[PDB]
Every structure is written in C-alpha cells, then in structure tokens.
Design a protein around this ligand. Structure first.
Ligand SMILES: Nc1ncnc2c1ncn2[C@@H]1O[C@H](COP(=O)(O)OP(=O)(O)OP(=O)(O)O)[C@@H](O)[C@H]1O
Ligand SMILES: Nc1ncnc2c1ncn2[C@@H]1O[C@H](COP(=O)(O)OP(=O)(O)OP(=O)(O)O)[C@@H](O)[C@H]1O
Ligand SMILES: Nc1ncnc2c1ncn2[C@@H]1O[C@H](COP(=O)(O)OP(=O)(O)OP(=O)(O)O)[C@@H](O)[C@H]1O
Ligand SMILES: [Mg+2]
Ligand SMILES: [Mg+2]
Ligand SMILES: [Mg+2]
Lengths: 236, 236, 236
C-alpha cells in the first residue's frame, strides 16, 4: 500500500469527521439577500445548541451612502409595519427588507429537532394579529426535518439548507439547532451537565456585509468551506 | 344554549389561558420615562426564565437633534458618576437619565421569585461605595412579591407591575423572571431538562423610542395588549 | 481585647471573604492596550460561569477624531485579514489592533478549568488555515492553570492575571470562568439546578475607553479594587 496515499486518506478523514467530536461546533450561516443583490451574513456556532437570534432592526439593509444607519432610524421604519400610522413614512421600506433568506447548517445536527422560526417585526409569534397573549416559541411549523435541502459538504455528509421568500414585511428570527444525540447518550445527564452548561453561548458571532453574492461566495463560502446554492441551482 | 355565544366563550378562554402552556412566553416590558416626557421601552420574553439585562448606556435617552448617540459618548457621561473627575463635564447629565422606571410583567410568572435588581452605573451591586469584593446577584430586596401592583390583563388574571423613581444617577438593570411551577412539577428534572435549556434566551429583544407617553400607549400598549398605568392612575 | 480593633478585623474579613458566598460574583476585566497607549476595558461578572465573549470588531480601537466608528467600517478592515483581497485597503490596520491583552480574574474561580481562547477574526478556532470543519471550543491550550500570574487582592487571596502579546492580526475572544466547587459539592446536582440556571448571564456588561493607562488605573482599577500590573511590573 502506498503510504503517501494512506496519509492523504487519514488527513481527509480527520477533516471530514472532526465535527462529530465532543466540543466541536455545529455551524449556522444565515444569509439575507436584498433587492439590489447585496447580502448580509450572520454566523453562529456552538457544540450543544446554536441559538441564532436576530432582531428585525439587524435584518434590514442598513447602509446609506456608505454609512451604517442607527437602530433608532431602522426601528422607526419598522414601526409602521407593526402598528398602523406609528411613524411618518409616506412610502414603504421594501428597498431595505430582504427578498430571500437562506439558512446554512453544517455539522452534527439533530435534524429532527432543528427549528427555524420566522417571527414578527417586534419579536412576537407571527400571525395575522400579533398579541402578547398568544406568544410562544417552537411552533410545530418551525421544525423543518425532511424539508431541509441536502448540499455537498465535501466529505462531511453534514450540510443542509433551508430557503424562504419574504413578502415585503420586516421579520425577526429565532433558530434553535440542537446537537445529534441519536447515539443513545444524554449529554445533559449526570456529572457532564455542568460542562455542557459552561459551553453554551461561548462563541463570538460575526456579521458581514457584501455588495453582491459573488463577493459572498468568494470571500466567505469558499474561504471557510460552507457550500452555498445560487438562484441557478449552482453550488459555490 | 346559543352556540354563537358558546363559540365566543371558547375563543375568549383560548386567548386568556394560552400563556399557561408549555413553551408559552412570559412577557416583560420595561419603560423608562425622561424629564421631557419621552419614553424608551425594552421588551423581553421567554417561557422559562426571562433575563432582562440593560446596561447603563442603554438606559440613557440617546437621541440628540434627531440622531442616535454612540455608546462611547454615553459612557463618557456616565463615567463621572461612577468615578470622581473621570470625564470633563462641567454640568450634570440629568436631562438624559430616567425620572421613572416601570416594569410590566405578564404571564405565568412565579411572583414569589421574580427579582428586579437596580444596579450601579457600571453593573456592580448598588451601595454607597461600590467595589468588586462586594458584588453579588439576587439581593433580598430585589424580590418584590406582594409589592407588585396588580393591573387588568383583560381575562388573563396575569399582569402585575412595579414602579421606581430614580434620583438623578445612572443605573443598570437586571430582571430575572422565573416560570410558575407551583403545580408541583419540576421542569428541570429528568429528560425534559435539555428541552428547557434549548429554549432559554431564544426570543429577539425589541427596543423602541417614543416622544411622549400617549404614543407608547397608542402604538405599543394597546396594539399588543399590555395594560399600562399613567401618572393619574388611569389605565391604557 | 480592644473592641474597636476587633470590629475593624471583622469588617476586613467580611469584605475579604464575601466573594466565596453563594450568588457572589466572580469578576473578569479584559484590557486591550493599543500602540498609542490608549486602553479599552471590558467587564463581565457571574457567580457560576463568566462567559466573556468579544467579537473582533469590538476589540478594535474604534474612535476616529472623537467619534465612534460603526461595526460596518470596522468589519470591512478586519475582512482583509480573514480573506485575501476582500476589501480595498492599500495599507494595514495595525494602528487599531491591540498590542497586548491583559485578563484580570478575581473571586472564587476554578483555576484548574478557567479557559481563555484567542480565536480568529471571524470567530473560528485559530490555526494557519481556518475552516468550518475544524472549529471547536475549549482547546487544551486554553486552560492556563499555573500559567496564571498571582497578584495582590488586598486580603482576598483571589486575584490572578494572564497576558498575551498580539502579532498584528485581529482576533476574537472567548473566556469561560467556572466557579470553584472543590469543596466537594455539585451545585448543578439536585433541586438547586434551576436556581443556578436562573442566575446565568444576568449581570450587565460594561465597556470603557481610556486615552492612557494611568486613566485606567485611577478611574477603574483603584476605584473598584482590581489590582493591575504595568509594563514596569509595578502594581496599581
Ligand atoms: N447543484 C446542486 N443543486 C442542488 N443539490 C445538489 C447540487 N449538487 C449536489 N447536490 C446535492 O448535495 C448532496 C450531496 O452531494 P454529494 O454527495 O455529491 O457531495 P459531497 O461532496 O460528497 O458531500 P457530502 O460529504 O456532504 O455528501 C446530494 O443530495 C446532491 O443531490
Ligand atoms: N385604574 C386603576 N388603577 C390601579 N389599579 C387598577 C385600576 N383599574 C383596575 N385596577 C386593578 O387591576 C386588577 C384587575 O382588575 P379587573 O379584575 O377589573 O381586570 P380584568 O380586565 O378582569 O383583568 P384580569 O383578568 O387580569 O383580572 C384589580 O386588582 C384592580 O383593582
Ligand atoms: N509588583 C509585583 N509584581 C508581580 N507580582 C507581585 C507584585 N507585588 C506582589 N506580587 C505578587 O502578588 C501575590 C500576592 O501578594 P501579597 O500577598 O503581598 O498581596 P495581598 O495584598 O496580601 O493580597 P492577597 O490577599 O491576594 O494575598 C504574591 O505572589 C506576590 O509575589
Ligand atoms: Mg457525498
Ligand atoms: Mg379580573
Ligand atoms: Mg497576601
């Protein structure tokens, strides 16, 4: 047996299987695409539960003539969608609302229980008439299961995505991504629990802005190894 | 029996009782009111533990001639209250410090254990002489219990509030709101624990700015069904 | 026995031992020092697990002619370090990257398990070639143990520090600081667990900017009782 090829094989497998390890992160990238094709990406990671929580103000395209707009200004625009005649806008804000959201998940994910909840502009459960009395988490619809779309992970057998088209109204996002424990062991049971609790919510988030999707593909997706799908069903 | 009225009754009860469900959110709205009557509201929600954590810089009225001030500028002003002669201010910043804070809680709350802790300008336990050695959470005074004021929830039997007048010094806030488990069942016990842990800290926050209290009543309180009390003891 | 001295002694001990109490905070101050000597400090606290999580954009010196720069502008500069030719910079950004980081820990810390992880510019595990497949938390190197440096805590016997020199590239930070439970009792075991979970992540953070280290010593360190060490090995 050729040991140079054996070494290559071991190297490949070490990279492919690493996400299955204890304390190895699951990965979440959310991409918002806007009408002129610009993109905003949000990255979250954790080994046990990813909690991808995005305010409606964070999901707006927030660049105006080269400067970043404030939460105050953005929330002012969002308000008129949440409550009738609560701001002074004479036209809509659709230029800054995403057309499409893409959710890229990679790693040792419990695909039965991963939930993606698209919520209202002030964070309440989405419905025709949002109200505090009827506000909850993890609605039945949020569990996508076999509605996830499989994508190449280049040997990892571990990337899927979900896509949604928005309808011209601001939204907020709550994504909960639990670790696969279908090997029959409860990591929250016994003395290990404290070690798991210590690891929750310990990875820095990262938000990036791109003027077009090819910049996203070139400087995020292919830089780090998250495969993305474009509007022509071609992978990058 | 009139079935149109029976249907109305069932509908009423479905709305009134929904917050008692597993995975139904408890709701927290904090309102800061400033000397010229403007208001800032902060909304938090969770089914298991609400953690309402606000920095002193976030609690300042932060609008200056139509633009939002930066954390850098706000913290600079706060500093002179925390440490003598640590900024260059020749006058106080009382114009931007809240006069009053109102805490509105709605849902299946453990009223015995809900805690509201008003902390110092850099997040330490409040005392005459703040110091790292004497910094802790959940002081005895923070549990309000029967000092909560009952307010109408329009059939829910589940809203209370707490009020405090400030004394011209910046503060920070830590509110911990645990779920009522007085039905005798520990949701943290057994296999359910992981499901509870997954649900913690998964709801987007929302901050709003209003120029006067009637805007708050019209476009937040009555829009979503949180009853608020004004300075004339009239509900909205 | 002189009871005025006995009272002094009891007072001293009450202050010295307070951090050992249940619900007493452990304290973390991170100080970034930049080439012109300016400093940024970040304070975190919790009684059970401190989670000090800082994005690469937050660690840049972010003041430009008296105004605070936006995350958009800062992330743009960081991008060129993460992905080749992903921004339009013709020179580096070393003026705004810390030269040195200092980590000050005070309280009832588990020194065996405290971990300080210096991560890449977009939050991934640091390595020559950062990639999503090889991203994890709590690497073996992050546990400093006896590589912590002991510093005076003025009777508390409970402050240590860690120092690192950076190499001109932006980084992100994840610090996990667990409570000392070497007295043989597991606080996550039994009915106490819910009370611990309720206390996680409930203390407001505080970020401060200083133009030079003596301002930091005078208006933070000596104001609150965190001892710091300067470049001459002198304490403040
Ligand atoms: N262009 C595409 N559009 C949609 N789906 C695609 C496309 N290309 C591949 N896929 C799907 O991705 C999945 C994985 O494909 P494949 O096995 O070729 O990738 P791989 O590099 O071996 O990665 P993995 O280790 O994740 O399997 C398959 O279900 C395949 O149909
Ligand atoms: N204007 C007010 N000022 C102060 N307290 C008030 C005011 N109006 C009502 N309350 C108090 O609110 C509480 C609930 O009142 P009430 O039972 O009339 O409301 P409800 O619409 O039935 O809501 P719930 O289902 O929460 O009881 C009572 O304790 C009442 O005294
Ligand atoms: N200037 C210094 N540079 C480096 N280390 C120092 C310096 N001064 C003191 N130390 C170290 O700090 C540690 C604690 O010193 P010391 O016992 O004098 O302080 P203390 O005020 O009693 O505080 P504690 O209660 O924390 O012991 C010792 O290991 C000492 O060597
Ligand atoms: Mg394959
Ligand atoms: Mg009633
Ligand atoms: Mg000593």
């Amino acid at each position: 047996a050729d040991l140079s090829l054996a070494r290559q094989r071991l190297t490949d497998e070490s990279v492919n299987e690493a996400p299955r390890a204890y304390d190895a992160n699951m990965e979440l990238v959310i991409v918002a695409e806007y009408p002129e094709g610009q993109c905003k990406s949000f990255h979250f990671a954790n080994p046990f539960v990813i909690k991808g929580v995005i305010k409606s103000s964070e999901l707006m395209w927030d660049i105006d003539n080269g400067h970043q707009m404030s939460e105050y200004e953005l929330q002012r625009s969002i308000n008129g969608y949440a409550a009738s005649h609560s701001n002074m806008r004479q036209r809509s804000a659709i230029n800054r609302i995403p057309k499409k959201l893409s959710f890229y998940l990679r790693g040792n994910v419990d695909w039965n229980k991963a939930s993606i909840d698209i919520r209202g502009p002030t964070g309440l459960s989405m419905r025709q008439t949002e109200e505090y009395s009827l506000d909850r988490i993890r609605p039945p619809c949020s569990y996508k299961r076999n509605k996830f779309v499989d994508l190449p992970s280049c040997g990892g057998r571990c990337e899927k995505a979900w896509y949604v088209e928005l309808d011209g109204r601001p939204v907020s996002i709550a994504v909960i991504v639990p670790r696969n424990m279908h090997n029959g062991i409860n990591l929250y049971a016994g003395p290990l629990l404290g070690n798991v609790i210590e690891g929750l919510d310990t990875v820095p988030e990262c938000t990036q802005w791109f003027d077009n999707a090819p910049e996203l593909y070139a400087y995020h997706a292919s830089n780090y190894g998250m495969t993305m799908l474009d509007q022509f069903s071609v992978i990058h």
